[PDB]
């Protein structure tokens, strides 16, 4: 799918090759985090921790918005 | 690594473990799509192909700005 990522559903995400799921999550997270991009830091551990929890959350709610599942899982890595 | 990604030089990127380099490349690309997020497109196979080219380019120019090499290699791929 060449759909813009913010339009991906959880279903679209599960279709990406396994080795690249953390990349799709990192991308969605950074694109929508919207804190100043000049201060944006790569949180490898955060992305690695949330990815399986996202594949999990996504499997249980295939039609949800992918970008939205990322934010909600990422809202447990800081809060 | 706590430096903001937009401040990274090639030396910082070469320090990222091989398994997370494509996530770093995709994260850098997302930071450039902050103004109109709903139009950002993630091309996972493109990330897969270009990452090793950026690693090599960075090895030969360690002092250079990381995002600039990301853009340079991606430009050589499309155009």
Curated annotation (Swiss-Prot), chains A, B:
Single GO cellular component term: outer membrane-bounded periplasmic space
Subcellular location: Periplasm
Disulfide bonds: 10-58
Keyword Signal belongs to the record: yes
BP GO annotations: cellular stress response to acidic pH
Keyword terms: Chaperone, Disulfide bond, Periplasm, Signal
Presence of the UniProt keyword Signal in the record: yes
Family the entry assigns: Belongs to the HdeA family.
Function (record text): Required for optimal acid stress protection. Exhibits a chaperone-like activity only at low pH by suppressing non-specifically the aggregation of denaturated periplasmic proteins.
Record protein name field: Acid stress chaperone HdeA
Gene this protein is translated from: hdeA
């Amino acid at each position: 799918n060449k759909k813009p990522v913010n339009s991906w559903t959880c279903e679209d995400f599960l279709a990406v090759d396994e080795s690249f799921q953390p990349t799709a999550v990192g991308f969605a997270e950074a694109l929508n985090n919207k804190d100043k991009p000049e201060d944006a830091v790569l949180d490898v551990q955060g992305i690695a921790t949330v990815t399986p929890a996202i594949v999990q959350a996504c499997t249980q709610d295939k039609q949800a918005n992918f970008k939205d599942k990322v934010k909600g899982e990422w809202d447990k890595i800081k809060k």
